[PDB]
Amino acid sequence: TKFSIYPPIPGEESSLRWAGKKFEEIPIAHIKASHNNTQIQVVSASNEPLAFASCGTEGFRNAKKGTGIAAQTAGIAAAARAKQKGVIHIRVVVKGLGPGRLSAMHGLIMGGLEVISITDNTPIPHXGCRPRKARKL
Amino acid sequence: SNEDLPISMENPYKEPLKKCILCGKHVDYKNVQLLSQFVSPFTGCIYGRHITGLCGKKQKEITKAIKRAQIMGFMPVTYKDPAYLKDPKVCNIRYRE
Amino acid sequence: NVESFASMLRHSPLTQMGPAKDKLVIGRIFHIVENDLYIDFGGKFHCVCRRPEVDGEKYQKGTRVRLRLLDLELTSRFLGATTDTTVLEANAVLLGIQES
Amino acid sequence: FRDDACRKEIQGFLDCAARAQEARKMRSIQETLGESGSLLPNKLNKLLQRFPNKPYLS
Amino acid sequence: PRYELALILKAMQRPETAATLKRTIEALMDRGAIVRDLENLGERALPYRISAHSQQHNRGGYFLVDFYAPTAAVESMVEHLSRDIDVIRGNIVKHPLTQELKECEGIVPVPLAEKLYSTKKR
Amino acid sequence: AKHLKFIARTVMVQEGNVESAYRTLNRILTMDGLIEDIKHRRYYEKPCRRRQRESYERCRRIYNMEMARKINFLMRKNRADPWQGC
RNA sequence: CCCCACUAUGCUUAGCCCUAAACCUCAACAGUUAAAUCAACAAAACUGCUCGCCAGAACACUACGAGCCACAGCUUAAAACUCAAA
Ligand code: FES
Ligand SMILES: [K+]
Ligand SMILES: [K+]
Ligand SMILES: [Mg+2]
Ligand SMILES: [Mg+2]
Ligand SMILES: [Mg+2]
Ligand SMILES: [Mg+2]
Ligand SMILES: [Mg+2]
Ligand SMILES: [Mg+2]
Numbered sequence: 001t002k003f004s005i006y007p008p009i010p011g012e013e014s015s016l017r018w019a020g021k022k023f024e025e026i027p028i029a030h031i032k033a034s035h036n037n038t039q040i041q042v043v044s045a046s047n048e049p050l051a052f053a054s055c056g057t058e059g060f061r062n063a064k065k066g067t068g069i070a071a072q073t074a075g076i077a078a079a080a081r082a083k084q085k086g087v088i089h090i091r092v093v094v095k096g097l098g099p100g101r102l103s104a105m106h107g108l109i110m111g112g113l114e115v116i117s118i119t120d121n122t123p124i125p126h127x128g129c130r131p132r133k134a135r136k137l
Numbered sequence: 138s139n140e141d142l143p144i145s146m147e148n149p150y151k152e153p154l155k156k157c158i159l160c161g162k163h164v165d166y167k168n169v170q171l172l173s174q175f176v177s178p179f180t181g182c183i184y185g186r187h188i189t190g191l192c193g194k195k196q197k198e199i200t201k202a203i204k205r206a207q208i209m210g211f212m213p214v215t216y217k218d219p220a221y222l223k224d225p226k227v228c229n230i231r232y233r234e
Numbered sequence: 235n236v237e238s239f240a241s242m243l244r245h246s247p248l249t250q251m252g253p254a255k256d257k258l259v260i261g262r263i264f265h266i267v268e269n270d271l272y273i274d275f276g277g278k279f280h281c282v283c284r285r286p287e288v289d290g291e292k293y294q295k296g297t298r299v300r301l302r303l304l305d306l307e308l309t310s311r312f313l314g315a316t317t318d319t320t321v322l323e324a325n326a327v328l329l330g331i332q333e334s
Numbered sequence: 335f336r337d338d339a340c341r342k343e344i345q346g347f348l349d350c351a352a353r354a355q356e357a358r359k360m361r362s363i364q365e366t367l368g369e370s371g372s373l374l375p376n377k378l379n380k381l382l383q384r385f386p387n388k389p390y391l392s
Numbered sequence: 393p394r395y396e397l398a399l400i401l402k403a404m405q406r407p408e409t410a411a412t413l414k415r416t417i418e419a420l421m422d423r424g425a426i427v428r429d430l431e432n433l434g435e436r437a438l439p440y441r442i443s444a445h446s447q448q449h450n451r452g453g454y455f456l457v458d459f460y461a462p463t464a465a466v467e468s469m470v471e472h473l474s475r476d477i478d479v480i481r482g483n484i485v486k487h488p489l490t491q492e493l494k495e496c497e498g499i500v501p502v503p504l505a506e507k508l509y510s511t512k513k514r
Numbered sequence: 515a516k517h518l519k520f521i522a523r524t525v526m527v528q529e530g531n532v533e534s535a536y537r538t539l540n541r542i543l544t545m546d547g548l549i550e551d552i553k554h555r556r557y558y559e560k561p562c563r564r565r566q567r568e569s570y571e572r573c574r575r576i577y578n579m580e581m582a583r584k585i586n587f588l589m590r591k592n593r594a595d596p597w598q599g600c
Numbered sequence: 601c602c603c604c605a606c607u608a609u610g611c612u613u614a615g616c617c618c619u620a621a622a623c624c625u626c627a628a629c630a631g632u633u634a635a636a637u638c639a640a641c642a643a644a645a646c647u648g649c650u651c652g653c654c655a656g657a658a659c660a661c662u663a664c665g666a667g668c669c670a671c672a673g674c675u676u677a678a679a680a681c682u683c684a685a686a
């Protein structure tokens with residue numbers, strides 16, 4: 001069958017499996033890529049926290065937290081703690097356009113986790129709160 | 138005078154005006170299947186007329202119908218209902234290379 | 235009994251053809267530049283077609299070919315221009331060679 | 335930082351650098367001179383010189 | 393005028409759904425409405441989770457009620473639907489079949505705008 | 515918040531190729547205008563400033579599309595000189 | 601100017617205040633594309649008719665008077681001294 005980039009819909013009968021688990025049962029790696037930091041939390045399909053890591057918890061400070069190499073290091077740290085709890089395949093949910101958006105996902109792969117899908121959940125208000133004023137530079 | 142002179146009349150070779158795919162059809166806010174053909178599968182965003190190929194009148198009717206269907210509980214907002222992903226592709230846009 | 239210009243124009247093949255789009259006409263190659271064939275088909279302007287890949291050597295000066303016309307003169311007005319820009323050549327598709 | 339234990343990794347980084355060097359040497363000969371795909375501005379401007387926009391009457 | 397009531401009812405069994413439809417149609421008649429037809433669009437999954445009357449809903453029964461009523465009945469009916477606990481969401485719109493679609497000849501092409509700048513030499 | 519999850523802005527990875535899946539997602543968010551929208555929302559753009567930006571972007575589209583139409587129209591004329599020497 | 605915090609304020613209701621580069625700096629209505637097309641630039645040049653407005657710069661979105669729910673306000677709005685430019 002031809003490959004489908006659209007995810008399998010829950011309730012329908014799909015043939016895709018990952019270690020005998022359905023798409024709805026794969027743990028989730030939530031990546032928050034901010035402008036000055038990156039936070040990674042791996043949770044189970046039932047929302048059980050499995051591992052957490054951020055550039056701050058890995059010894060980076062100030063402007064060094066807002067780098068790709070710092071997010072990659074946090075991704076490796078989260079993957080190490082998640083792999084010990086029996087995680088292999090993960091669904092990546094990333095929010096924010098920070099410098100550690102893609103690097104955090106590389107660290108998860110370098111740590112031994114297999115990404116089966118990528119989801120963006122960057123918050124976009126449809127009209128919302130007024131953001132801060134522009135900067136004079 | 139002379140029989141071979143040109144005569145004044147309307148262009149007989151004039152082609153009929155083109156019509157949009159929805160010309161002469163009723164757009165209802167309950168017909169979510171039709172409305173789903175004009176939103177993005179991934180973000181639910183409404184496509185502009187340069188993508189949908191609709192005329193001004195139907196681009197407006199589709200837009201108003203979607204906004205009504207969304208807030209009245211007939212149509213999702215943040216994505217295209219997966220049940221309609223295999224409908225005829227009438228919009229001019231490709232996301233995969 | 236001298237035929238007038240209005241009579242000539244009414245009964246000319248170019249007038250009887252009507253719109254030129256998607257009309258099959260017979261052309262004549264009068265000039266060749268590498269693989270560019272310059273073809274006259276009875277209009278104001280010639281058309282330039284590329285030498286086909288099959289039987290390319292059969293297209294020489296004087297060879298009579300079959301064309302599908304698209305426009306007798308390629309013109310278009312662009313943003314800010316007061317008149318149309320013309321490339322002084324017709325638009326046609328070379329179908330093949332005409333043979334008896 | 336003992337090179338004796340990192341030979342395979344050092345070699346890979348060396349071979350890649352040489353391959354990336356030759357490719358960089360060819361990218362100039364091909365893309366800069368051949369003008370693959372769309373024309374370059376200089377060539378495209380010569381074509382516009384022959385059909386200038388006419389915002390006035392003559 | 394002629395209106396259309398888009399009614400999303402709580403997912404219930406047939407007896408409670410019939411009692412809700414009857415109770416709703418009578419509310420229209422009590423306000424001077426002339427009910428024309430009742431259509432069942434079937435039970436389905438809501439496009440999004442809806443919270444109504446201190447409860448979360450994921451499915452609902454879709455029903456349509458075509459009716460005539462005086463203009464003053466709409467405001468009073470909207471207030472009635474807000475208090476019925478078995479109604480997830482109910483909207484009253486002017487019936488779409490009353491609006492007659494004008495004929496369309498086709499797409500009239502728009503030529504490039506001309507004479508936007510004087511023809512002086514610049 | 516109230517919608518189903520793992521449907522919007524979701525791309526499946528093929529044969530472990532995570533880079534191509536990420537590029538597909540980024541291309542989707544770009545074509546739908548979400549990327550530029552997120553960036554413009556980091557700081558508040560005052561209404562008069564937004565109107566000026568929209569006018570600038572619309573005039574740029576009109577100019578760029580007309581220049582492109584003229585380039586494609588004249589490209590056939592880029593062939594070899596047929597009357598070299600005259 | 602950059603970072604953080606927080607207030608009047610931005611919202612609703614009921615009253616005020618009556619200002620803007622409130623500028624598309626192009627008055628309303630009717631008509632023309634021919635003649636001399638037109639200082640320059642800007643968004644081509646004109647005709648009929650009407651109302652409003654203008655007459656060196658600065659003093660001056662000022663002083664005084666008058667009106668106004670306005671009391672550090674708004675509207676209307678000069679002169680003397682000064683210069684040969686603006
Ligand atoms: S062209 Fe007729 S409705 Fe669109
Ligand atoms: K004013
Ligand atoms: K202005
Ligand atoms: Mg406050
Ligand atoms: Mg509000
Ligand atoms: Mg204004
Ligand atoms: Mg007036
Ligand atoms: Mg003066
Ligand atoms: Mg003032």
Ligand SMILES: [Mg+2]
Pocket residue numbers: none
């Ligand atoms: Mg004053």
Ligand SMILES: [Mg+2]
Pocket residue numbers: none
């Ligand atoms: Mg006073």
